[PDB]
Amino acid sequence: DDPVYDAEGNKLVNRGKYTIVSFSDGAGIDVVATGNENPEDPLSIVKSTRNIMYATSISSEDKTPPQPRNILENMRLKINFATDPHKGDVWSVVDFQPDGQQLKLAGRYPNQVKGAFTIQKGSNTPRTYKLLFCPVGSPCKNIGISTDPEGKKRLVVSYQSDPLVVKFHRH
């Protein structure tokens, strides 16, 4: 499969740090409390509405050596925050009642869905991609945005979600 390219046109490096940024508006990834969550202990991964853009390490899920030098499209991945305040926190999908499958920091909610993330070309515009979630033993779903009653742009997972198109900035 094709290697995924960063915004500068270089192949993504396996385990490298990149800043995922929304193509159409430049917003990055943020972690805030949504719903009944405590604002001092945010657990929701969202598209930022406050100019925050956290960097993430993107790694192949399979760690058996030799690991791929570059990230390829449709390759199973593990994504984790690379910097404070959530250094090392891993992205996970939680089948959140009654909202549905959404992205949350891993290890907090018990209802996590086993699976991995993958990347595919997101549009005709070069170096633009979309993220998918592929649960174990099930077809892959798109990752899109859903605005909650408080105005937070939650990252949700569904077959019908309009894919969030992003670019990867080397960080």
* Residue 58 phi, psi (nearest 5): -120, 115
Map out the domains of the chain as residue ranges. 1-171
Top CATH class of 1-171 equals: mainly beta
Q: What is the DSSP string of 54-83?
A: --EEEEES--PSSPPSB-BTT--EEEEE-S
CB 143, CB 130: distance < 8 Å: yes
Distance, CA of 54 to CA of 28 (rounded, Å): 7
Q: Given in angstroms, what resolution was this structure solved at?
A: 1.8
